[PDB]
């Protein structure tokens, strides 16, 4: 067994981490006090769930997680919330004042003063590991901390844990879901500094999550809790293979092996189905054919783009619930004759399939209905470059007038870092255009 440390950075990283660990405990039969009656080995073990949870002699199951934020009000909710008893205090790290939506302030000014404490707390987690695989890193693109501190942390993790895999779950900014004016700057600055240190990164567009919450859950004005419980179902689908007995995506390395033929193009598109309203007075359960077809609906993608106008480099289907391989193949055959699925010609036209028999777990009193089967598709398609072009265009609009740049220079950043990061994104856009 090989351990995984999760790192949540900034408000969005922390609140999503809350939602994920709430869900994990429900999936594994772990109560909020950390106890786990099914675990008949007290004080330790090397089961699959031990990749995410350590154990104390009192039988408490403790997330291998650190929460980091530059101000204390979000993590203070963790310290006093339902799951307060779950986390060691050393794992919840807060500063005095935040990065004010300024990458430069999170990276240079405040980052410099807190990074060694964060690394010291992570090292304590790593010293509990018999064989650490690497890190899962959760943050917003748009926040000062999420962008600026995460990129500093990623650089230092590469130094201190050179061999170890790093995966990101990144929240891509959408004005539907309260954004700062400067989030295009922060997104581009953090992508450029983080690109070479991330092996595989899952972007979640707040616009897509927002729309699914409106259209499928009939929530007129989604809250962060609504957004985060939906996001945590997708994260759980992606990480289920590390926490349960399985044979696909068993370690962090396998995500790169299966999804990323070229290091820079390491942003797989996630599509999830079905999302069903819990207050649905009457519902009808969808079949394997139907949820697999739904994975090629842009309305169900985590990033709004059009895969029919890109090319695929890799594709994984992750099913939870009542699914057998025979159904998956019949559904794939039907879809391939009806959908625009074009692979790049230097790659096999195939699907790696994983099935976990336990149907998705849902938070009691939540917005999501229990379904007999669900699937998350991870596909590396050039179509996701649409989101980069959108973001790069907004950056270009503001940067041509140098709007807001003085805030970043004022924190010790040089204007040259702006254009350097922007030319890296242009190269990245050209890379997608070459392969697609």
């Amino acid at each position: 067994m090989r351990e995984c440390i999760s790192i949540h950075v900034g408000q969005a990283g922390v609140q999503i981490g809350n939602a994920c660990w709430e869900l994990y405990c429900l999936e594994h039969g772990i109560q909020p006090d950390g106890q786990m009656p099914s675990d008949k080995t007290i004080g330790g073990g090397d089961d699959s769930f031990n990749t995410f949870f350590s154990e104390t002699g009192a039988g408490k199951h403790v997330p291998r997680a650190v929460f980091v934020d530059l101000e204390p009000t979000v993590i203070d909710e963790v310290r006093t919330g339902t799951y307060r008893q779950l986390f060691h205090p050393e794992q919840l790290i807060t500063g005095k004042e935040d990065a004010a939506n300024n990458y430069a302030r999170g990276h240079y000014t405040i980052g410099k003063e807190i990074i060694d404490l964060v690394l010291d707390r992570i090292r304590k987690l790593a010293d509990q590991c018999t064989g650490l695989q690497g890190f899962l890193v959760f943050h917003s693109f748009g926040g000062g901390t999420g962008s600026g501190f995460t990129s500093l942390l990623m650089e230092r993790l590469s130094v201190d844990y050179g061999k170890k895999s790093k995966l990101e779950f990144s929240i891509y900014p959408a004005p539907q879901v309260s954004t700062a004016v400067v989030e295009p700057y922060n997104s581009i600055l953090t992508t450029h500094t983080t690109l070479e240190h991330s092996d595989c990164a899952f972007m979640v567009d707040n616009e897509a999550i927002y729309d699914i919450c409106r259209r499928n859950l009939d929530i007129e004005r989604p809250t962060y809790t609504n957004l985060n419980r939906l996001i945590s179902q997708i994260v759980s689908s992606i990480t289920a293979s590390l926490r349960f007995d399985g044979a696909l995506n068993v370690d962090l390395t396998e995500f790169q092996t299966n999804l990323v033929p070229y290091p820079r193009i390491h942003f797989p598109l996630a599509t999830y189905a079905p999302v069903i309203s819990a207050e649905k007075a009457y519902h009808e359960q969808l079949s394997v054919a139907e949820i697999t077809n739904a994975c090629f609906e842009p309305a169900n993608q985590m990033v709004k783009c059009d895969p029919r106008h890109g090319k695929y480099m890799a594709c994984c289907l992750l099913y939870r619930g009542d699914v057998v391989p025979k159904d998956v193949n019949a559904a794939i055959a039907t879809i391939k004759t009806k959908r625009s699925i074009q692979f790049v010609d230097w790659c096999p036209t195939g699907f790696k399939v994983g099935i976990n028999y336990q149907p998705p777990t849902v938070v009691p009193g939540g917005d999501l209905a229990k379904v007999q089967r669900a699937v998350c598709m991870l596909s590396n398609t050039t179509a996701i470059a649409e989101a980069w072009a959108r973001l790069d265009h907004k950056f270009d609009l503001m940067y041509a007038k140098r709007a807001f740049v003085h805030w970043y220079v004022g924190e010790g950043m040089e204007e040259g870092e702006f254009s350097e990061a922007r030319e890296d994104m242009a190269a990245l856009e050209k890379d997608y255009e070459e392969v697609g």
């Binding site: 130094v159 070479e196 998956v328 230097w346 924190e411």
Partner: protein, 54 residues
């Protein structure tokens, strides 16, 4: 259409289907960047205090 690498266990199973075949910066360096930005912040503050002293 071919099914390969079928693995089964009590929790589920995994397999691959194929439709068609095909046709870092050091610690010192980061520290220097951080110190360079700090120095520029220190320069700008000193210019401010010098302006205010005048």
């Amino acid at each position: 259409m071919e099914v390969i690498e079928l693995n089964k266990c009590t929790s589920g199973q995994s397999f691959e289907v194929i439709l068609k075949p095909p046709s870092d910066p050091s610690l010192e360096e980061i520290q220097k960047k951080l110190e360079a930005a700090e120095e520029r912040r220190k320069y700008q503050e000193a210019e401010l205090l010098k302006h205010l002293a005048e």
